[PDB]
Each structure stands twice: as C-alpha cells, then as structure tokens.
Design a protein around this ligand. Structure first.
Ligand SMILES: *[C@@H]1O[C@H](CO)[C@@H](O)[C@H](O)[C@H]1NC(C)=O
Length: 356
C-alpha cells in the first residue's frame, strides 16, 4: 500500500481549499522515484465545476480521501505485475485541481475554486526531497489522461525546479499515457457546454483563464499570449521539451473519440473518419523516438493491473520502458530491445493483444 501524506504547506490546495497531497511507498536502497499524476478530465467554468463538485468530489477535495491506496500496474511493487520498476519509490499524486495540472491560482474572494495543479506538483517534489528524493538518480514523472498531458506540461518545470534547488544529478524524465490528443474536427458538431463532448480547443482556451493556467516556457514563447492552449496538445508541446519523454497513446483513444463526438455496422463516413484519426495520430508520433501506440479502442494503460498484456510488434510496454532506460544509460539502437513501437494497422483491435 501507498500511504497518504497531506501537504505540509496547506496553502497548496485542491479545488475546494482542502490540502492537496500524495500517496507514498518508499523503497530503501532504490534511487528511482516514480511520481504518477492521476487523470480525470477537467472543469472550466463555475457551472461545470459545481456539477463536478457534487458527483466527482474526490477530484476536487481531499476531505474524503482514504489513508492508503494500493499501487497497481506501474505503481505495483510486485515484479509479476510490474516487470519495469517494481522496486522503485512509488508516489501517486491525486488529481484534485481539475485543471490538467496547469493551474496556479488560489481560492479567494474572487475565485470559488483554487486551480493549483502546477503548484501541487512543485510542492510534492519539494516535500519528497526531505523523504529521500534528494538521493534519487531518476525521477520519472508519469501520468494518465489529463495526468499524461500534465506530464507534458510539467516535466521540464520539475527539471528546472530540481536544478535551481541544487540537485543537478537527478535525471528527470516523463511518461505521458493517454495524454496525447489531437485538436481535430469532430465527426459531428456538438455545442460544447458539457465537458466530455466539447471540442478540446475551446474547453482549454476557457480553462486557462479560469485556472490561471501555465504552460512550458519554450512553448509559451512560440505560441504567445492568447494562444497557450496550443501547448496542451502533445504534438505541439513535445518538440519544445528538453527532458526525455516516453509517449503511450492508443491510436483510437476513447476520450479522443468522445471529444470528437464518435459513439460506437459502421458506414463509410465514420469508417474513413476513424481510419484518418489513426493515421493522423501515427503521423504525429513518427518522430517521437520513445513511444508505444497500439491500434486499439481503449483508454489509459499504465496503472491497470494487466498493463503487461498488450504488445506492439511483439514487445510489451514494460519491456519498451526497460529498453528506454537502457537507451538513456551513459551512451544507437539496442539489439532486440526497441523503444519506438507504433502500430501501422488501420482499425481498432487489428492488434490481437488489445484489451478486451
Ligand atoms: C507554500 O506554497 C506557496 C505556493 O507554492 C508558496 O508561495 C509558499 O512559499 C509556500 N510556503 C511554504 C512555507 O512552503
């Protein structure tokens, strides 16, 4: 089990002003640290955040969090479930800021909610340094869905934070799972309003100002004021990052299909739409050297217990991540240990290993 620690700096809060926190299982003698950012969509105005507060309150408040959580998938300490990093120090950071980990705003007489995702990550890192992270050799910032996008938005800031704090030997890396979205046209137009079926460009443009959202500096400098929403789209932000980032993305991600207003005999227009989506996402990954992109209709991968099962070209994700670790040793591709694994077949579940 991972044990809850509420942040000692209680000014760094969940949406409702309760303290944010993290769940930790230490592994003495390991100098690897895995910090995982939970996902769960976002909210971008008072009305939709109020609805989320009624029926998704654990994503906005720590008041009802349990004292422990079981680490699963890449957070498991059992080698059978986690061939990759079972002996690492494990950290699960609950998502309670509803801001894709981008916010830096407190609750105030002018803000019903605090959006502090970017500061939560910073404060978790700061407090972990006193609990053994100061001795780390690798800090892998991982996350799923909005947490995967949160990795892209925050990995270089964590790297900069550690350098400025005097820890230049900690190698900061990112693992972004199911957080690589396309700002494409919907299959059928929806009128936003709700969160899941809203086109993501407009939801994020609204959220940035509502949240006081921050993006990585190089990407901000490219897109400039009013256009920072672009940095929430992996294919646009990734080339600006300096930290190594491994991208895991289903080619037919269910959340991508949801925001595209696709709901699954498929007729020609939808067939072409789906095939074109897979081709576009494959294209965006062509120059991403560390990636795992199976041709499946599914959503998230890394913290589920059976994450070991899917393979691309005969290689599982735990194996690909291990090959990535080897590629980042003091050092040319590795014999039989690939790191770029993108399916080329054009329809969901054309890979027989896709989740059932
Ligand atoms: C608490 O966090 C806030 C926001 O990051 C920061 O401005 C402040 O310095 C922190 N205070 C302490 C005592 O860590």
């Amino acid at each position: 089990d991972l044990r809850l620690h509420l942040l000692l700096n209680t000014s760094v809060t969940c949406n409702d002003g309760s303290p944010a926190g993290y769940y930790l299982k230490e592994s003495r003698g390991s100098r690897r640290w895995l910090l995982f950012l939970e996902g769960g969509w976002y909210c971008f105005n008072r009305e939709n955040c109020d609805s989320r507060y009624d029926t998704m309150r654990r994503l906005m408040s720590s008041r009802d969090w349990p004292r422990t959580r079981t680490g699963t998938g890449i957070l498991s300490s059992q080698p059978e479930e986690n061939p990759y990093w079972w002996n690492a120090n494990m950290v699960f950071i609950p998502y309670c800021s509803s801001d894709v980990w981008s916010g830096a705003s407190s609750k105030s007489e002018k803000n019903e909610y605090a959006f502090m995702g970017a500061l939560i990550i910073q404060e978790v890192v700061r407090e972990l340094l006193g609990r053994g992270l100061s001795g780390a050799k690798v800090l892998l910032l991982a996350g799923s869905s909005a947490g995967g996008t949160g990795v892209l938005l925050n990995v270089d800031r964590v790297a900069e934070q550690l350098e400025k704090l005097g820890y230049p030997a900690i190698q900061v890396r990112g693992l972004a799972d199911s957080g690589w979205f396309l700002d494409n046209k919907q299959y059928r137009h929806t009128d936003c309003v709700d969160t899941i079926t809203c086109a993501p460009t407009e939801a994020i443009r609204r959220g940035i100002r509502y949240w006081n959202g921050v993006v990585p500096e190089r990407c901000r400098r490219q897109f400039q004021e009013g256009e920072e929403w672009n940095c929430f789209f992996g294919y646009k932000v990734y080339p600006t990052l300096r930290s190594p980032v491994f991208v895991v993305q289903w080619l037919f991600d269910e959340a991508q299909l949801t925001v595209d207003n696709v709901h699954l005999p498929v007729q020609e227009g939808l067939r072409l739409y789906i095939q074109n989506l897979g081709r576009e996402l494959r294209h965006t990954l062509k120059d991403v050297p560390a990636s795992f992109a199976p041709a499946c209709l599914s959503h998230e991968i890394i913290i589920r217990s059976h994450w070991t099962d899917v393979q691309v070209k005969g290689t599982s994700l735990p194996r690909a991540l291990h090959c990535w670790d080897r590629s980042l040793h003091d050092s040319t591709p590795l014999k039989g240990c690939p790191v770029h694994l993108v399916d080329s077949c054009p329809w969901p579940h054309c890979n027989p290993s896709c989740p059932t």
